[PDB]
Amino acid sequence: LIDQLHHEDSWRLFRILAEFVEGFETLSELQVPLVSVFGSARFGEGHPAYEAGYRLGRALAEAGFGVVTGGGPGVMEAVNRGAYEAGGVSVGLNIELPHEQKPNPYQTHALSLRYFFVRKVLFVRYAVGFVFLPGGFGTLDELSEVLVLLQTEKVHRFPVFLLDRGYWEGLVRWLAFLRDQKAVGPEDLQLFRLTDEPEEVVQALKA
Amino acid sequence: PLIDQLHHEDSWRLFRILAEFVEGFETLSELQVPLVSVFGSARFGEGHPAYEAGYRLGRALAEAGFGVVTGGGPGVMEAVNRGAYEAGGVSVGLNIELPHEQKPNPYQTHALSLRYFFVRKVLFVRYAVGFVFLPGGFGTLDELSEVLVLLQTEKVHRFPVFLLDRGYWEGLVRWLAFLRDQKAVGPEDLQLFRLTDEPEEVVQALKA
Amino acid sequence: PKKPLIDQLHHEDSWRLFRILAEFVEGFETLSELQVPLVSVFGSARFGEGHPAYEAGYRLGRALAEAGFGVVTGGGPGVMEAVNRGAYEAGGVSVGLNIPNPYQTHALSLRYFFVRKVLFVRYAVGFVFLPGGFGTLDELSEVLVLLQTEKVHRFPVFLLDRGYWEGLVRWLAFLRDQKAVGPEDLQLFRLTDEPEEVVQALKAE
Amino acid sequence: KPLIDQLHHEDSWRLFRILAEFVEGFETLSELQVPLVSVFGSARFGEGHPAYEAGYRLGRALAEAGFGVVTGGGPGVMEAVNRGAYEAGGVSVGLNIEPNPYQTHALSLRYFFVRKVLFVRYAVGFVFLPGGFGTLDELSEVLVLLQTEKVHRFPVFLLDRGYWEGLVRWLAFLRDQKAVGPEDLQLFRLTDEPEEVVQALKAEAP
Amino acid sequence: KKPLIDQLHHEDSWRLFRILAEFVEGFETLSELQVPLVSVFGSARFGEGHPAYEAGYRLGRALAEAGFGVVTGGGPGVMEAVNRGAYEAGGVSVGLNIELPNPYQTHALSLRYFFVRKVLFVRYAVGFVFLPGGFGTLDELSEVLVLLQTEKVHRFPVFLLDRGYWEGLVRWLAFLRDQKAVGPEDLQLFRLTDEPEEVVQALKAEAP
Amino acid sequence: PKKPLIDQLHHEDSWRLFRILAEFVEGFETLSELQVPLVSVFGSARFGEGHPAYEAGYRLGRALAEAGFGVVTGGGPGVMEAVNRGAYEAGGVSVGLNIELPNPYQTHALSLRYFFVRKVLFVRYAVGFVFLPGGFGTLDELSEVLVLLQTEKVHRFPVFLLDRGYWEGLVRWLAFLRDQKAVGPEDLQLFRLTDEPEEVVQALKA
């Protein structure tokens, strides 16, 4: 049987298990409500998405929320920074990639994960809401994931916001096409909300 | 006490999660044919273009010698499992347990029932030699965006990714091209997938 | 081909063990959430429609349901099916710990027999045994040991059909004569020919 | 508070204890390098009793024929079996339940169902001597497992014709009642001589 | 012919689960004891007749009568002396046996890993007594001193029986403090004493 | 108020144990993929630059890296840093098994949370072990090594104590243990005293 359980590669589960445990340990003991935030790892200082990210972080911490990001560069860094400097709780769920990049230096708690799926469960398990700033493959990845879990009711409902109407217009319309094709329910597009103001997102969560 | 702390951690959930991973590995590991993950709408039934196309793809892959792995649900997944099943090929369903349960189709040579989307998503890639996305909705988009990420960042081998039915994906691909003009995605990232109208082209690429 | 269940376990394959643990977790959630009092019943898997034990099984399930109790069986054919059927058709809560008859309100799907053994007693308010073979003797035997050694909370145990249990009960009296069992270990179970005497007894506790 | 009643779907640690016993038991038994015969008998019949003498001689002969013995590790007949095997230079295992001095290998278990798996997992044979509830409990489980094929097949022997007479005659009643298959009673053989048990086991082994 | 440690590999899951099992059983078994636990380690070679062995018995018994439970490495020699003394006195006698066990243990733990045994030795100890021994005893003593010095475990008195036997070692340790290799109060982590009675005496002076 | 590491181990918190198991996994992976022969080295964490111990450490590291060996230390300050620094600066592979809850001369810096995992990592791939003047930590590591070697719990490898003058008292006392018969005849041969890195290198070479 040595060959079977080998091709089974179950030993990979020790670390996967270590990652879940630490994650539950760390996130479950936080005292403030957690808001998961996402955005481009590539939009740095100056970029509208970065500035909006920093303002989002700041406002969330000053409202009592803690922020959970991938702890990477770009708007993630901006969001961690905004909440960090404001003194709020700032979590980073760092993913280990073949083409790394150091974790931003604005994490109150920093978790280092090897698997996206563990990182994904941790983004949802303790969230009172999710906010998506302009991003790329990774951001769409997270979004589509939350949409499914909500639409299918696998996880309790929670507010989902997409910041910057013009950036997301393209996706929203295709989703409307999906609704026209009857691929998604008649009320499924109301699972998320578009806005151009961070302040508006925070007010909505503050309730 | 710590009893409260351990309670908030809610780790007893891992027993089931682990059982599903272990069972999933034991099962898929034993299969002896290259496995192709296939996705499509759970709502487009018999008669619908996506369904017929799915039936043809399922049948073609089995003929070529591949086993198909789907979410075991209705619509295109059913058609894909059926095409494979009826051509005598290995047909796998990674059925997901939902609040408003859809019934598992009857065309699965191997059926697994999972409570967790993430476990199911892992089993979908761990043993795949390719991915085919047929018209679908939120469920399909979620699988597509996940695999694209895994390929873009290179966490898994760059196996072939196909999107069947050009006109259907047009909106998404154009928006992705916009993500490119914005530099939110790499210059070559749109080459991670191939858009096509011909099931034959997909099977041919996988055979090659 | 595929080996017997127990033999599929190898000291090398440790992760496989979590499949057993998860079965316990799931089983405990499923049965503990139920609020009706749960009475376990075991009996022959070969006595079908028209057999005395089957008819008795049907009357028992019915009476138990009529009384507000829930019944827990092995979920198979024979007197087992009779009991789930009698309870089920009377509007009672019917549970089956399946290793399946179509008379189950809650059908548990279990891979391991020993998890079932634990589930039969973890929430038991009583346990009734009807005419059966090895499986029934197996289950009765374990229940006596478990109670005799106090590995589980105490509950009444009834054996239905005096003539049928006769030989075994007498042999047990012999074991007591030999001093293999304690002075009052045979007081762990009660003998009766009436499903009504079983329901009365349980209601009285 | 009873062991079973302490089991809750949320108290993970109690579930890990079950895991721990499965791990240490499979690890210990699997590495033994002699065919393993399980033995069960009265915990109450100490030296002087005919079952004890029978158990002592059985373990002895077992050890001498190159078999290892696996008992519950308690007093009485179990002690006698371990002792007879131990004093003959043989491997002598005790699956102690939460212990006689004649155990070359001693396991500490809290969960009965785990011990029950370990009793049969590597069993090449199973012998039952005169006993009480514990003995009836183990025997009847082995027969169910052999009957429904939940474990590889292995011989089962009952020792002391006069003591098991009531139980056997009744199993015949069961077969006649047809609550048991035609050759299900054939799953075991009733005997008086421990030496033939060992002889028959050697015959069923190459 | 393979040493325990060399059999560990990141892919050999079962051996890592045995490590898991030893922690689970070790912590459960010891945590449930309702008597103050005092760990004792000494020569596995010195037998009946030798002072160390004799003193082990007095220690074992005196501890049991003062209401303390004893935890030893569970082997022969002085280890067995302590187990026997406490046991025959009706006290709680624990053995952390290593599968390289004396019959005087109220609870016998089967251990294969030296590092799991080391943790279990101090996890619940309210005192540690060291009798004349060899490599094993020095090893366990060094461990305790480092864990205490370093605050890796809660504090507890440490006693060394037989001022003569330990003479060479304590002076060398004194040399270390002279050399600044150790801190100003690190030699205070232990005390020499000639009779078991004294240790049980100093112990009785503890938590109210 | 938090407590010392060990006291944070509760019997009810079973899942937290996988963090330890994961640590071993990662540890075994990191170290086993290295191709250079790994020599574990231990010494005082207090003796810094200028202290004979530190200077001896630097030369030992240099000597081992130049001879082709990779060094493995606890990764801290004092003689540890000295050793890593000597090998690192000589272009050798420098490894530190750091307990993080680390000196700048490490090619590979492992981050460990459990000190007991580290103890296994110090010997699992050891081709040899060198101990320099130190205190409680060094003696603790020496003892464990001697015990694991004595009872053959790990493959044999050379153990060297550098600075005869400093180890004198300990070695003298150990000889006393042999007179007392607490240790075996050949047991003291498990280690060797030396006043120079070069003897260590010529030895490892052979």
Give me the long-range contacts of A121-124 (CB less than 8 A, separation at least 24). A121/A20, A121/A23, A121/B118, A122/A23, A122/A27, A122/A68, A122/A93, A123/A36, A123/A68, A123/A93, A124/A36, A124/A149, A124/A155
Cα separation of E166 and B89, whole Å?
A: 76
Residue of A140, A147, A177 to mutate, testing the B interface (most B Cβ within 10 Å of its Cβ): A140
The CATH number of the structural domain formed by D12-206 is 3.40.50.450
- Token couple for A2: 């040595």
Domain boundaries, chain C: 14-205
CB C117 within 8 A of CB D113: yes
State the number of CA atoms in the 13 A half-sphere of F193 facing the CB: 12
- SS3 label, residue E159: strand
Distance CA D92, CA B10 (A): 42
Asked whether the beta carbons of A32 and A127 are under 8 A apart, the reply is no
- In CATH, what number does B11-208 get? 3.40.50.450
Dist. CA B84–CA B54, nearest whole Å: 10
CATH among 3.40.50.2000, 3.20.20.10, 3.40.50.450, 3.40.50.300 for F14-206: 3.40.50.450
- Give the number of other CB atoms < 10 A from CB of residue A176: 13
CA distance E173 to E167: 10
Does D12 lie at the interface with F, CB-CB under 8 angstroms? Answer: yes
**3-class DSSP state for residue D155?**
coil
Interface of E with F in 174-203 (CB under 8 A): 175-176, 179-182, 186
Please check whether the domain covering E13-208 is classified as CATH 3.40.50.450: yes
For residue D19, give Cα distances in angstroms to C19, C178, D14, D110, E34: 11, 38, 9, 11, 25
**Residue among D104, D106, D117, D197 nearest D157 (CA):** D197
Please state, in angstroms and rounded to a whole number, the distance separating the CA atoms of residues C182 and C171: 14
Residues linked to residue C42 through DSSP beta bridges, in sequence order: C129
What is C95-162 written as a DSSP string? EEEE---S--SEEEE-S-HHHHHHHHHHTEEEEEE-S-SHHHHHHHHHHHHHHHTTSS----EEEE-H
Task: Name every chain A residue with its beta carbon within 8 A of the beta carbon of B171.
Answer: 170, 173-174, 177
Distance CA C104, CA D69 (A): 44
Contact partners for chain A, using 3 or more CB pairs closer than 8 A, are: B, C, E, F
D188-191 and A66-69 as β-strands: parallel, antiparallel, unpaired? unpaired
- In order of B50, C74, D15, D129, the CA distances from D157 in angstroms are 65, 29, 34, 9
Domain C14-205: assigned CATH number: 3.40.50.450
Resolution of this entry, Å = 2.2
Give me the residue label for tokens 């590790």.
Answer: D73
Smallest CA-to-CA distance from A51 within A166, A134, A123, A131 is with A134
Q: Which of C20, C114, C167 sits opposite D116 (nearest CB)?
A: C114
- A25 interfaces chain F, CB cutoff of 8 Å: yes
Which CATH class name applies to A10-207?
alpha beta
Distance from CA of D13 to the nearest CA of F (A): 5
Contact call for residues C174 and C181 (beta carbons, < 8 A): no
Which structure tokens are listed for C152? 């589980």
CB contact, 8 Å: B11 with chain C? no
Cβ pair B179, B149 in contact under 8 A: no
**CB proximity list for C166: less than 8 A, separation 6 or greater:** none
Strand partners, F162: F194
The H or E element spanning position A69 is strand A66-69
Q: How far is CA D71 from the centre of its chain?
A: 6
Q: Which residues are CB-neighbours of F203 under 8 A, at least 6 positions away?
A: F128, F158, F160, F192
Residues of C in contact with E14 (CB under 8 A): 11-14
DSSP string computed for C35-53: -SPEEEEE--SS--TTSHH
In this structure, what are the phi and psi dihedrals at residue E190, rounded to the nearest 5 degrees?
-150, 170
Q: What DSSP state is assigned to residue D4?
A: G
Sheet of F70-73, strands arranged across: F108-112, F94-99, F70-73, F38-42, F126-131, F159-162, F191-194
Q: What distance in Å separates residue D32's CA from the closest CA in chain F? A: 20
Q: What is the DSSP string of A114-173?
A: S-HHHHHHHHHHTEEEEEE-S--HHHHHHHHHHHHHHHTTSS----EEEE-HHHHHHHHH
d(CA B106, CA B72): 9
Residue A123 distance to chain C (closest CA, Å): 25
Alpha-helix runs per DSSP H in F33-135:
52-66, 79-88, 115-123
Q: Which tokens in the block code for residue A9?
A: 């590669």
Contact C22 B26 (CB under 8 A): no
Neighbours of B197 (CB within 10 A): 12
| Dist. CA F43–CA E151, nearest whole Å | 20
CA D198 – CA D189 distance, rounded (Å): 13
